[PDB]
Amino acid sequence: DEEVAALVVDNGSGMCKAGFAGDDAPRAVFPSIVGRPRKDSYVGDEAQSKRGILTLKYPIEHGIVTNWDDMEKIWHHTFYNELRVAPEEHPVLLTEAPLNPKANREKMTQIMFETFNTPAMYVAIQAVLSLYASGRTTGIVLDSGDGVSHTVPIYEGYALPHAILRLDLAGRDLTDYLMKILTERGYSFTTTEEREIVRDIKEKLCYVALDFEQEMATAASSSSLEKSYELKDGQVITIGNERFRCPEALFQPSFLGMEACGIHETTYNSIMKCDVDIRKDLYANTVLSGGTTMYPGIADRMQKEITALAPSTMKIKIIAPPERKYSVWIGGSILASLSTFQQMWISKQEYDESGPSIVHRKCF
Ligand SMILES: Nc1ncnc2c1ncn2[C@@H]1O[C@H](COP(=O)(O)OP(=O)(O)O)[C@@H](O)[C@H]1O
């Protein structure tokens, strides 16, 4: 091979995924955190491990970069610590959130070429990459991560900004809600350490009920839905209706005091904002992505809820890839490996010729 490996870096609100184009999975995943004492800067797992003696910062808390100084440190960490490569020696494909401000796109571009001296780079919308990973160029993606969720209609490879909806309800909120209802049950999960334990309980024992009320009735009259969970100190606790009550908040945000529409309604509203001529393509190609869409039963629940909102004559299909937790990264690996994509990279030459603003033309 003549070309060096290209890098794929998925910038997540909670976890960053990094690896090499062509691979089937990211080589590294770490917390999008930077910490400094209350070694001068700590990034990733280490910052989390030593959070006791540090003040943590979340530079991309809700999907959008808010502090470029710390984001630069996360990227430095990604190259030198996680992937152990020199960025000046590899093209880099970066991901961005839907509705990312134009100025931010230019900033990312300038930093890659001027700070890291990348030989080439490109930036793609997360939702679009997930759609690519599913083998489609048209459809609507419901991306629910750690600090944010989005419904992104995509037609022929292009996201439709006017129809994109943002929901400030995701994995983080669900974890805290589970801590709250488990505490109401009689336990006590309130500390940061306990938040990590509940996050684990959430990822392992929660599920989306097909019918909330029926599930609540079953849990109230029997122990058939109860599951045991063992804490590190040996204590075994019981999780009952909390298993499905937690993710139910995605469909009924009021449980969290939020007036926002649930994910099914948000998906429907996005589709309705698109040209009537492509709505059927979206209904027939609703793809789920992100860690928060991993709950067992979520696909069937979405199918049921969307069917209730859409015309009776509409064909509804929910696609839930088993590997959807990393579909963004995988889509990037696929894209960066495409023969026709090689001409699309922004080269250092092109950057020197046109400057940061070239990103709008090259990465439309
Ligand atoms: N199996 C699972 N069930 C439910 N939630 C999960 C599961 N696996 C991961 N999560 C949650 O998904 C979120 C992270 O997903 P991700 O798409 O990586 O987000 P981001 O890109 O914003 O960091 C976290 O809140 C995590 O707890």
Any ligand 1 atom below 6 A from CB of 302 = no
Q: How far is the CA of 61 from the centre of ligand 1 (A)?
A: 14
Q: How far is the CA of 295 from the centre of ligand 1 (A)?
A: 10
Contact 137, 255 (CB under 8 A): no
Any ligand 1 atom below 6 A from CB of 290 = yes
Contact 142, 243 (CB under 8 A): no
Among candidate residues 343, 360, 347, 337, the one with its CA nearest the CA of residue 132: 337
CA atoms of 122 and 232, how far apart (whole Å): 44
Contact 164, 99 (CB under 8 A): yes
CA dihedral for 105, 266, 130, 44, sign (positive or negative): positive
Cβ-based neighbour number of residue 9 at 10 Å:
26
CA atoms of 201 and 212, how far apart (whole Å): 20
Any ligand 1 atom below 6 A from CB of 294 = yes
Among candidate residues 3, 189, 149, 122, the one with its CA nearest the CA of residue 63: 149
Which element (helix H / strand E) includes 65?
none
Contact 359, 106 (CB under 8 A): yes
Q: How far is the CA of 54 from the centre of ligand 1 (A)?
A: 24
Domain residues for 209? Answer: 169-260
Q: In terms of domains, do 254 and 319 share one?
A: no
Q: In terms of domains, do 256 and 272 share one?
A: no
Residue 136, token pair as written in the block: 């489609």
Of 209, 244, 260, which closes a domain? 260
DSSP 247-294: HHTTT-GGGGT--S--HHHHHHHHHHTS-GGGHHHHHTTEEEESGGG-
Q: In terms of domains, do 238 and 183 share one?
A: yes
Number of domains present in the structure of the chain: 3
| DSSP-based three-state secondary structure for 84 | coil
| DSSP-based three-state secondary structure for 130 | helix
CATH code (residue 154)? 3.30.420.40
| Measured torsion, CA atoms of residues 78, 83, 86, 90, in degrees rounded to the nearest 10 | -100
Q: In terms of domains, do 133 and 102 share one?
A: no
Q: In terms of domains, do 158 and 270 share one?
A: yes
| Measured torsion, CA atoms of residues 360, 66, 10, 129, in degrees rounded to the nearest 10 | -50
Q: How far is the CA of 169 from the centre of ligand 1 (A)?
A: 12
Contact 252, 262 (CB under 8 A): yes
State CA 51 to chain mean position distance: 23
Q: In terms of domains, do 236 and 284 share one?
A: no
Q: In terms of domains, do 266 and 160 share one?
A: yes
Q: In terms of domains, do 226 and 311 share one?
A: no
Q: In terms of domains, do 160 and 269 share one?
A: yes
Experiment used for this model: cryo-EM
Within 50-145, residue ranges assigned H as helices are: 68-77, 102-110, 126-133
| DSSP-based three-state secondary structure for 351 | helix
Of 260, 287, 302, which closes a domain? 260
Atom in ligand 1 nearest the alpha carbon of residue 14 = 23
Any ligand 1 atom below 6 A from CB of 147 = yes
Residue 141 buriedness (CB in 10 A; 0-12 / 13-18 / 19+): buried
Q: What is the DSSP letter of 138?
A: S
Q: How far is the CA of 275 from the centre of ligand 1 (A)?
A: 32
CATH code (residue 207)? 3.90.640.10
Q: In terms of domains, do 112 and 9 share one?
A: yes
Resolution stated for this PDB structure, in Å: 4.3
Q: In terms of domains, do 351 and 297 share one?
A: no
Contact 231, 244 (CB under 8 A): no
Q: In terms of domains, do 38 and 102 share one?
A: yes
DSSP 2-27: -SPPPEEEE--SSEEEEEETT-SS-S
Among candidate residues 245, 264, 263, the one with its CA nearest the CA of residue 255: 245
